[PDB]
Short mmCIF file of N, CA and C in Angstrom, two decimals:
data_model
loop_
_atom_site.label_atom_id
_atom_site.label_comp_id
_atom_site.label_asym_id
_atom_site.label_seq_id
_atom_site.Cartn_x
_atom_site.Cartn_y
_atom_site.Cartn_z
N UNK H 1 0.91 -1.23 0.01
CA UNK H 1 -0.02 -0.03 -0.01
C UNK H 1 0.85 1.21 0.04
N UNK H 2 0.69 2.21 -0.95
CA UNK H 2 1.33 3.34 -0.97
C UNK H 2 0.58 4.68 -0.84
N UNK H 3 1.07 5.72 -0.42
CA UNK H 3 0.20 6.93 -0.14
C UNK H 3 0.11 7.60 -1.49
N UNK H 4 -1.05 7.35 -2.21
CA UNK H 4 -1.37 8.03 -3.47
C UNK H 4 -2.78 8.67 -3.56
N UNK H 5 -3.14 9.04 -2.34
CA UNK H 5 -4.63 9.64 -2.30
C UNK H 5 -4.51 11.12 -2.21
N UNK H 6 -5.35 11.84 -3.03
CA UNK H 6 -5.36 13.29 -3.04
C UNK H 6 -6.58 13.85 -3.89
N UNK H 7 -6.75 13.23 -5.02
CA UNK H 7 -7.82 13.64 -5.99
C UNK H 7 -7.45 14.83 -6.68
N UNK H 8 -7.49 14.73 -8.01
CA UNK H 8 -7.11 15.85 -8.91
C UNK H 8 -8.29 16.88 -8.99
N UNK H 9 -8.65 17.40 -10.13
CA UNK H 9 -9.83 18.31 -10.25
C UNK H 9 -10.07 18.78 -11.78
N UNK H 10 -11.23 18.70 -12.25
CA UNK H 10 -11.67 18.95 -13.58
C UNK H 10 -13.11 19.21 -13.75
N UNK H 11 -13.47 20.32 -14.30
CA UNK H 11 -14.92 20.73 -14.62
C UNK H 11 -15.69 19.53 -15.17
N UNK H 12 -17.00 19.57 -14.87
CA UNK H 12 -17.91 18.50 -15.43
C UNK H 12 -19.24 19.11 -15.96
N UNK H 13 -20.29 18.32 -15.95
CA UNK H 13 -21.61 18.85 -16.21
C UNK H 13 -22.70 17.93 -15.61
N UNK H 14 -23.52 18.65 -14.85
CA UNK H 14 -24.63 17.78 -14.09
C UNK H 14 -25.44 17.07 -14.98
N UNK H 15 -25.44 15.67 -14.94
CA UNK H 15 -26.24 14.88 -15.79
C UNK H 15 -27.42 14.36 -14.90
N UNK H 16 -27.12 13.64 -13.78
CA UNK H 16 -28.26 13.05 -12.96
C UNK H 16 -27.61 12.40 -11.63
N UNK H 17 -27.70 13.00 -10.53
CA UNK H 17 -27.10 12.50 -9.29
C UNK H 17 -27.96 11.23 -8.84
N UNK H 18 -27.31 10.04 -9.01
CA UNK H 18 -28.03 8.73 -8.69
C UNK H 18 -28.18 8.58 -7.07
N UNK H 19 -27.14 8.70 -6.43
CA UNK H 19 -27.20 8.54 -4.94
C UNK H 19 -26.06 9.47 -4.21
N UNK H 20 -25.78 9.14 -3.07
CA UNK H 20 -24.85 9.98 -2.34
C UNK H 20 -23.35 9.92 -3.23
N UNK H 21 -22.53 8.94 -3.03
CA UNK H 21 -21.36 8.89 -3.72
C UNK H 21 -21.65 8.66 -5.25
N UNK H 22 -22.75 7.99 -5.57
CA UNK H 22 -23.01 7.80 -7.00
C UNK H 22 -23.62 9.00 -7.73
N UNK H 23 -23.05 9.58 -8.73
CA UNK H 23 -23.27 10.80 -9.43
C UNK H 23 -22.95 10.71 -10.91
N UNK H 24 -24.03 11.09 -11.73
CA UNK H 24 -23.82 11.15 -13.25
C UNK H 24 -23.33 12.49 -13.72
N UNK H 25 -22.17 12.55 -14.30
CA UNK H 25 -21.70 13.84 -14.97
C UNK H 25 -20.61 13.65 -15.94
N UNK H 26 -20.29 14.64 -16.78
CA UNK H 26 -19.23 14.35 -17.80
C UNK H 26 -18.02 15.11 -17.38
N UNK H 27 -17.00 14.42 -16.96
CA UNK H 27 -15.76 15.17 -16.43
C UNK H 27 -14.92 15.47 -17.62
N UNK H 28 -14.97 14.62 -18.65
CA UNK H 28 -14.09 14.91 -19.95
C UNK H 28 -15.08 14.77 -21.25
N UNK H 29 -16.29 15.24 -21.09
CA UNK H 29 -17.21 15.17 -22.19
C UNK H 29 -17.72 13.69 -22.32
N UNK H 30 -17.56 12.94 -21.32
CA UNK H 30 -18.14 11.58 -21.29
C UNK H 30 -19.08 11.32 -20.14
N UNK H 31 -20.39 11.05 -20.48
CA UNK H 31 -21.43 10.84 -19.55
C UNK H 31 -21.13 9.56 -18.79
N UNK H 32 -20.74 9.60 -17.53
CA UNK H 32 -20.56 8.26 -16.75
C UNK H 32 -21.06 8.42 -15.40
N UNK H 33 -20.59 7.61 -14.35
CA UNK H 33 -21.03 7.73 -12.97
C UNK H 33 -19.90 7.52 -12.10
N UNK H 34 -19.70 8.29 -11.06
CA UNK H 34 -18.53 8.11 -10.19
C UNK H 34 -19.02 7.79 -8.71
N UNK H 35 -18.53 6.77 -8.15
CA UNK H 35 -18.90 6.36 -6.73
C UNK H 35 -17.72 6.56 -5.72
N UNK H 36 -16.42 6.11 -6.16
CA UNK H 36 -15.28 6.17 -5.28
C UNK H 36 -15.52 5.27 -4.18
N UNK H 37 -16.27 5.52 -3.16
CA UNK H 37 -16.46 4.60 -1.96
C UNK H 37 -17.86 3.87 -2.24
N UNK H 38 -18.63 4.49 -3.18
CA UNK H 38 -19.94 3.85 -3.47
C UNK H 38 -20.96 4.20 -2.26
N UNK H 39 -22.16 4.78 -2.57
CA UNK H 39 -23.17 4.94 -1.39
C UNK H 39 -23.71 3.61 -0.92
N UNK H 40 -24.80 3.51 -0.34
CA UNK H 40 -25.38 2.29 0.26
C UNK H 40 -26.88 2.23 0.19
N UNK H 41 -27.46 2.54 -1.06
CA UNK H 41 -28.94 2.55 -1.07
C UNK H 41 -29.52 1.13 -1.18
N UNK H 42 -28.97 0.39 -2.12
CA UNK H 42 -29.55 -1.05 -2.23
C UNK H 42 -29.14 -1.76 -1.03
N UNK H 43 -30.03 -2.37 -0.29
CA UNK H 43 -29.85 -3.13 0.87
C UNK H 43 -30.57 -4.48 0.82
N UNK H 44 -30.05 -5.39 0.18
CA UNK H 44 -30.85 -6.80 0.17
C UNK H 44 -32.06 -6.59 -0.57
N UNK H 45 -32.16 -7.21 -1.66
CA UNK H 45 -33.38 -7.19 -2.63
C UNK H 45 -34.40 -8.19 -2.05
N UNK H 46 -35.56 -7.68 -1.58
CA UNK H 46 -36.63 -8.63 -1.02
C UNK H 46 -37.61 -8.99 -2.22
N UNK H 47 -38.13 -10.29 -1.94
CA UNK H 47 -39.01 -10.80 -2.94
C UNK H 47 -40.29 -9.89 -3.19
N UNK H 48 -40.88 -9.40 -2.03
CA UNK H 48 -42.05 -8.51 -2.10
C UNK H 48 -41.67 -7.20 -2.56
N UNK H 49 -42.64 -6.46 -3.18
CA UNK H 49 -42.23 -5.13 -3.77
C UNK H 49 -42.09 -4.07 -2.55
N UNK H 50 -41.04 -3.36 -2.77
CA UNK H 50 -40.79 -2.30 -1.64
C UNK H 50 -41.09 -0.94 -2.11
N UNK H 51 -40.20 -0.11 -2.33
CA UNK H 51 -40.57 1.34 -2.88
C UNK H 51 -39.27 1.95 -3.38
N UNK H 52 -39.41 2.63 -4.54
CA UNK H 52 -38.26 3.31 -5.15
C UNK H 52 -38.12 4.68 -4.57
N UNK H 53 -36.72 5.02 -4.26
CA UNK H 53 -36.41 6.27 -3.60
C UNK H 53 -35.38 6.91 -4.51
N UNK H 54 -35.46 8.25 -4.62
CA UNK H 54 -34.47 9.03 -5.47
C UNK H 54 -33.09 9.03 -4.69
N UNK H 55 -33.17 9.21 -3.30
CA UNK H 55 -31.93 9.22 -2.53
C UNK H 55 -32.31 9.14 -1.02
N UNK H 56 -31.31 8.60 -0.15
CA UNK H 56 -31.46 8.32 1.11
C UNK H 56 -31.62 9.67 1.98
N UNK H 57 -31.41 9.71 3.18
CA UNK H 57 -31.56 10.86 4.01
C UNK H 57 -30.38 11.92 3.79
N UNK H 58 -29.20 11.69 4.50
CA UNK H 58 -28.06 12.61 4.27
C UNK H 58 -27.57 12.58 2.81
N UNK H 59 -27.57 11.42 2.19
CA UNK H 59 -27.15 11.31 0.78
C UNK H 59 -28.10 12.09 -0.06
N UNK H 60 -29.24 12.40 0.26
CA UNK H 60 -30.30 13.09 -0.52
C UNK H 60 -29.79 14.56 -0.67
N UNK H 61 -29.22 15.04 0.35
CA UNK H 61 -28.65 16.46 0.24
C UNK H 61 -27.41 16.49 -0.54
N UNK H 62 -26.63 15.38 -0.46
CA UNK H 62 -25.41 15.17 -1.33
C UNK H 62 -25.83 15.16 -2.73
N UNK H 63 -27.03 14.76 -3.08
CA UNK H 63 -27.51 14.65 -4.55
C UNK H 63 -27.61 16.13 -5.04
N UNK H 64 -27.89 17.07 -4.10
CA UNK H 64 -28.12 18.50 -4.56
C UNK H 64 -26.66 19.09 -5.02
N UNK H 65 -25.66 18.68 -4.34
CA UNK H 65 -24.33 19.22 -4.68
C UNK H 65 -23.87 18.49 -6.00
N UNK H 66 -24.69 18.59 -6.98
CA UNK H 66 -24.45 17.92 -8.32
C UNK H 66 -25.69 18.22 -9.31
N UNK H 67 -26.80 18.39 -8.85
CA UNK H 67 -27.91 18.59 -9.76
C UNK H 67 -27.99 20.16 -10.09
N UNK H 68 -27.43 20.98 -9.34
CA UNK H 68 -27.48 22.40 -9.80
C UNK H 68 -26.07 23.11 -9.72
N UNK H 69 -24.96 22.18 -9.59
CA UNK H 69 -23.66 22.65 -9.52
C UNK H 69 -23.11 22.95 -10.90
N UNK H 70 -22.76 24.21 -11.23
CA UNK H 70 -22.29 24.61 -12.70
C UNK H 70 -20.83 24.47 -12.61
N UNK H 71 -20.06 25.01 -11.77
CA UNK H 71 -18.58 24.83 -11.62
C UNK H 71 -18.30 23.54 -10.95
N UNK H 72 -17.61 22.58 -11.68
CA UNK H 72 -17.28 21.34 -10.86
C UNK H 72 -15.88 20.94 -11.07
N UNK H 73 -15.29 20.13 -10.27
CA UNK H 73 -13.96 19.84 -10.30
C UNK H 73 -13.77 18.33 -9.88
N UNK H 74 -14.46 17.51 -10.74
CA UNK H 74 -14.33 15.96 -10.40
C UNK H 74 -12.97 15.66 -9.98
N UNK H 75 -12.66 15.42 -8.79
CA UNK H 75 -11.28 15.13 -8.28
C UNK H 75 -11.09 13.53 -8.34
N UNK H 76 -10.29 13.13 -9.32
CA UNK H 76 -9.99 11.60 -9.31
C UNK H 76 -8.55 11.34 -8.76
N UNK H 77 -8.57 10.69 -7.63
CA UNK H 77 -7.28 10.53 -6.86
C UNK H 77 -6.20 9.71 -7.84
N UNK H 78 -4.97 10.01 -7.70
CA UNK H 78 -3.94 9.25 -8.51
C UNK H 78 -4.26 7.80 -8.67
N UNK H 79 -4.46 7.27 -9.77
CA UNK H 79 -4.87 5.91 -9.96
C UNK H 79 -6.39 5.70 -9.45
N UNK H 80 -7.24 5.86 -10.52
CA UNK H 80 -8.55 5.90 -10.22
C UNK H 80 -8.97 4.56 -9.41
N UNK H 81 -10.06 4.54 -8.64
CA UNK H 81 -10.58 3.50 -7.72
C UNK H 81 -11.12 2.41 -8.70
N UNK H 82 -10.41 1.83 -9.60
CA UNK H 82 -10.94 0.73 -10.42
C UNK H 82 -11.03 -0.50 -9.62
N UNK H 83 -11.52 -1.53 -10.30
CA UNK H 83 -11.63 -3.00 -9.64
C UNK H 83 -11.93 -3.96 -10.72
N UNK H 84 -13.30 -4.25 -10.82
CA UNK H 84 -13.52 -5.43 -11.81
C UNK H 84 -14.10 -4.79 -13.12
N UNK H 85 -15.10 -3.97 -13.03
CA UNK H 85 -15.65 -3.32 -14.18
C UNK H 85 -14.78 -2.05 -14.49
N UNK H 86 -14.11 -1.53 -13.42
CA UNK H 86 -13.26 -0.30 -13.59
C UNK H 86 -14.17 0.95 -13.97
N UNK H 87 -15.14 1.09 -13.07
CA UNK H 87 -16.06 2.38 -13.24
C UNK H 87 -15.30 3.57 -12.87
N UNK H 88 -15.83 4.72 -13.03
CA UNK H 88 -15.07 6.06 -12.66
C UNK H 88 -15.13 6.27 -11.24
N UNK H 89 -14.58 5.41 -10.45
CA UNK H 89 -14.74 5.62 -8.97
C UNK H 89 -13.94 6.94 -8.51
N UNK H 90 -14.63 7.96 -8.25
CA UNK H 90 -14.13 9.26 -7.73
C UNK H 90 -15.16 10.07 -7.16
N UNK H 91 -14.90 11.30 -6.76
CA UNK H 91 -15.82 12.23 -6.11
C UNK H 91 -16.06 13.50 -6.89
N UNK H 92 -17.13 14.07 -6.89
CA UNK H 92 -17.36 15.38 -7.58
C UNK H 92 -17.14 16.62 -6.64
N UNK H 93 -16.46 17.61 -7.18
CA UNK H 93 -16.29 18.79 -6.26
C UNK H 93 -16.74 20.01 -6.83
N UNK H 94 -18.14 20.23 -6.88
CA UNK H 94 -18.83 21.32 -7.53
C UNK H 94 -19.82 22.05 -6.46
N UNK H 95 -19.74 23.31 -6.47
CA UNK H 95 -20.58 24.16 -5.61
C UNK H 95 -20.58 23.56 -4.13
N UNK H 96 -19.50 24.00 -3.38
CA UNK H 96 -19.26 23.47 -2.01
C UNK H 96 -17.96 22.64 -1.97
N UNK H 97 -17.72 21.95 -2.97
CA UNK H 97 -16.45 21.18 -3.00
C UNK H 97 -16.43 19.93 -2.11
N UNK H 98 -16.31 18.69 -2.61
CA UNK H 98 -16.33 17.55 -1.81
C UNK H 98 -17.74 17.13 -1.40
N UNK H 99 -18.69 17.86 -2.05
CA UNK H 99 -20.24 17.56 -1.71
C UNK H 99 -20.58 17.60 -0.29
N UNK H 100 -19.63 17.97 0.62
CA UNK H 100 -20.03 18.04 2.06
C UNK H 100 -20.66 19.40 2.38
N UNK H 101 -21.76 19.73 1.66
CA UNK H 101 -22.47 20.98 1.94
C UNK H 101 -23.27 20.98 3.24
N UNK H 102 -23.75 19.83 3.59
CA UNK H 102 -24.44 19.62 4.98
C UNK H 102 -23.61 19.85 6.07
N UNK H 103 -23.69 21.02 6.83
CA UNK H 103 -22.88 21.30 7.92
C UNK H 103 -23.65 21.32 9.25
#
């Protein structure tokens, strides 16, 4: 394990905030989704029908730091958080930076 965490920065375009860490935006003109640590909305799929929710409690406010953020700085730490599919695992830094607007 080496210290390679810091996250860079690059403007993007609000496409659709899926959940807390999950967010859809174009950091390089490419519509994708970035989770980094990945939120936790899906919790065990039950056989009976449950209910569709746009976003959890605190993560719902995190969804706002992306639906109306004009200036963005998608910070992707050195060596993106890839794994099996190699998604764009990173965080968005627009309007508030780090999406930590809830204080």
